[PDB]
Design a protein around this ligand. Structure first.
Ligand SMILES: N[C@@H]1[C@@H](O)[C@H](O[C@@H]2O[C@H](CO)[C@@H](O[C@@H]3O[C@H](CO)[C@@H](O[C@@H]4O[C@H](CO)[C@@H](O[C@@H]5O[C@H](CO)[C@@H](O[C@@H]6O[C@H](CO)[C@@H](O[C@@H]7O[C@H](CO)[C@@H](O)[C@H](O)[C@H]7N)[C@H](O)[C@H]6N)[C@H](O)[C@H]5N)[C@H](O)[C@H]4N)[C@H](O)[C@H]3N)[C@H](O)[C@H]2N)[C@@H](CO)O[C@H]1O
Ligand SMILES: *[C@@H]1O[C@H](CO)[C@@H](O[C@@H]2O[C@H](CO)[C@@H](O)[C@H](O)[C@H]2NC(C)=O)[C@H](O)[C@H]1NC(C)=O
Ligand SMILES: *[C@@H]1O[C@H](CO)[C@@H](O)[C@H](O)[C@H]1NC(C)=O
Length: 538
């Protein structure tokens, strides 16, 4: 006896939608992104000779999203708040029974990666897979510019082997006076201004929208993937490892300048609000990393810095945490507040980290760049654990900084020790005593991989193997270095031996773990060492 309505046939229209719209052709951030709180779906259907007064429903994965009459040649529009891949069906009803259209798939995109398959990886180069068993922090920085000459997109990141991924860097909008430090690097200040065009200063932006959201990378080349570039892959990343913490790092050396204006409480509040907006917009992020270099000055800008920064650093941490607290209220998620701080005691002394730590999850202790080509007559270890035998009252070492930091009353668990995946070096090192090249003087920077005076560990590791270097290991300082007595070339770096030693130090002293700058300069050796040295499972 049953005679349901005719089978609805879905008309043609849009099949992909986005809760957060991204303009694939925008240079400015304000034109690049619009966050909506829901997407907006439309479906057309048609039944030749039907009863328009029948009942109609639109079902996304067998759940109701709309309800009306439709009947014969109908139409519906409704709002979807959570992204994913949905099977869409139109259902017709009369007094006998119901009819279901054939399913059509739709993509509702959103920035927590819901619409995306998991970013998958293969261990590359010397990486060996580990399990994060130790409960220790194992972090690494990923630079935005890595996708250009460096050829290191997100998919080359060995994500079984990390607990934290720091994205460097996120800028703060500012022109002349605000962000002058960017001018030492050609194109970059200008690149920022184009990005922040029409944007209030002291809000956060994206330094390179192309790299971040528009560049095609593996898995996202199709002409309408809502999100491509770096952010796109990072979304797929949280989908392979939902527990891997991905933090946006704000500042760094050449972007830290706006922080010195946060003495102005009005500007600070705008900033914190913009970070809140940033996280609601880019949901794959898990909180905030602050990289102000440095509170009190002595960073890129020789004209910026005040003792009054130590107190600002703590109020920024208080207000940021409070923002994340109400961000958690609305989203039910947990967020991390972290920060990268100097390992020099004279910069540490500026801030009361015992005062700030109650707001923070972790402190990434920049225990590298202790020495470099910025000096011809202060040669030494760039990232050593202890002072060298030929200079016992050396204050710029991992150990000294950590002890100094703890002495403020910081809880050892929050301190995450830094490891260098790069070398700093010199050339023309002459006039040294006792076959120790550090007692002499250089005539300039070593020849660098990308930049002068800096060398990727992969480059160093490979050339040591071609016999192009004299390898030595300071067993007292716990740091390696290569030397070339001919040309007078000298390079300080971290290798797997010093890195395992930092691991043993972290564990002996009940520290938080290790992190590395920067992930692309490693061949796998060092991250293997970090994991093997913190007690993780192979
Ligand atoms: N005693 C002090 C010394 O301490 C001091 O030395 C300083 O010590 C600190 C210690 O903390 C060092 O800082 C640490 O290490 C890293 C760097 O080593 C720090 O990172 C900083 O952050 C900023 C973020 O903006 C970095 O900016 C980026 O720098 C790169 C250059 O490598 C730029 O490259 C340019 O990229 C653009 C595009 O993005 C390129 O243009 C593109 O070209 C491609 C080609 O294919 C094309 O397709 C594209 O269309 C086009 N867009 C352009 O050609 C590149 N030049 C990035 O753009 C730029 N964002 C910055 O590098 C880095 N400094 C980190 O904070 C910290 N962990 C200090 O670095 C060190 N200076 C010394 C100072 O010498 O003084 C003593 O007194
Ligand atoms: C390291 O030493 C080199 C060479 O002594 C310095 O470079 C020279 O700087 C002077 C300054 O006018 C120039 O006349 C020379 O041409 C430069 N180099 C050479 C090879 O002649 C360099 O400035 C020193 N670096 C630091 C950080 O002190
Ligand atoms: C290295 O440079 C310092 C700078 O003052 C100088 O005093 C010293 O004599 C130099 N050493 C050699 C071996 O040239």
């Amino acid at each position: 006896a049953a005679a349901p309505p005719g089978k609805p046939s879905l008309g043609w229209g849009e099949r992909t939608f986005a809760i957060v719209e991204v303009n694939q052709a925008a240079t400015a951030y304000n034109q690049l992104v619009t966050k909506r709180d829901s997407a907006d779906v439309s479906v057309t259907w048609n039944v030749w000779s039907g009863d328009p007064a029948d009942k109609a429903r639109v079902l996304l994965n067998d759940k109701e999203f709309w309800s009306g009459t439709g009947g014969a040649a109908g139409s519906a529009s409704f709002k979807v708040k959570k992204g994913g891949r949905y099977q869409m069906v139109v259902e017709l009803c009369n007094a006998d029974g119901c009819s279901q259209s054939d399913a059509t798939e739709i993509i509702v995109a959103d920035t927590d990666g819901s619409h995306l398959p998991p970013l998958d990886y293969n261990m590359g180069e010397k990486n060996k897979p580990f399990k994060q068993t130790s409960g220790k922090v194992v972090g690494a920085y990923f630079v935005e510019w890595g996708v250009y000459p460096r050829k290191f997109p997100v998919d080359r990141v060995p994500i079984p082997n990390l607990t934290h991924l720091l994205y460097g860097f996120i800028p703060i909008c500012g022109g002349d006076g605000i962000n002058d430090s960017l001018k030492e690097i050609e194109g970059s200040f200008q690149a920022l201004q184009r990005s922040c065009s029409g944007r209030e200063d002291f809000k956060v932006s994206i330094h390179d929208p192309w790299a971040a959201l528009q560049k095609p990378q593996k898995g996202l080349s199709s002409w309408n993937e809502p999100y491509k570039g770096n952010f796109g892959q990072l979304m797929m990343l949280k989908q392979a490892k939902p527990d891997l913490k991905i933090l946006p790092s704000i500042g760094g050396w050449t972007l830290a300048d706006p922080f010195f204006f946060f003495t102005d409480e009005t500007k600070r509040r705008r900033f914190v609000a913009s970070v809140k907006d940033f996280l609601q917009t880019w949901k794959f992020f898990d909180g905030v990393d602050i990289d102000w270099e440095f509170p009190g000055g002595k960073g890129a800008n020789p004209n910026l810095g005040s003792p009054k920064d130590g107190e600002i650093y703590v109020l920024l941490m208080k207000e940021l945490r409070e923002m994340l607290n109400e961000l958690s209220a609305e989203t039910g998620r947990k967020y991390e507040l972290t920060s990268a701080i100097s390992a020099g005691w004279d910069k540490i002394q500026v801030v009361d980290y015992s005062a700030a730590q109650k707001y923070m999850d972790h402190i990434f202790f920049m225990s590298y760049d202790f020495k470099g080509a910025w000096s011809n007559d202060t040669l030494g270890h760039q990232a050593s654990l202890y002072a060298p035998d030929w200079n016992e009252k050396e204050t710029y070492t991992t150990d000294f900084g950590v002890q100094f930091l703890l002495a403020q009353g910081v809880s050892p668990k929050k301190i995450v020790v830094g490891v260098a995946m790069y070398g700093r070096g010199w050339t023309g090192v002459h006039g040294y005593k006792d076959n120790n090249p550090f007692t002499g003087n250089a005539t300039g920077p070593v020849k660098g991989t990308w930049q002068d005076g800096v060398v990727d560990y992969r480059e160093i590791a490979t050339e040591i193997a071609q016999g192009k270097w004299e390898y030595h290991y300071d067993k007292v300082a716990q740091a390696p270095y290569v030397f070339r007595p001919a040309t007078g070339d000298l390079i300080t770096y971290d290798d797997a031996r010093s890195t395992i030693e930092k691991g043993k130090y972290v564990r002996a002293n009940k520290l938080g773990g290790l992190f590395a700058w920067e992930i692309d300069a490693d061949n796998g050796d060092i991250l293997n060492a970090m994991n093997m040295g913190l007690g993780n499972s192979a």
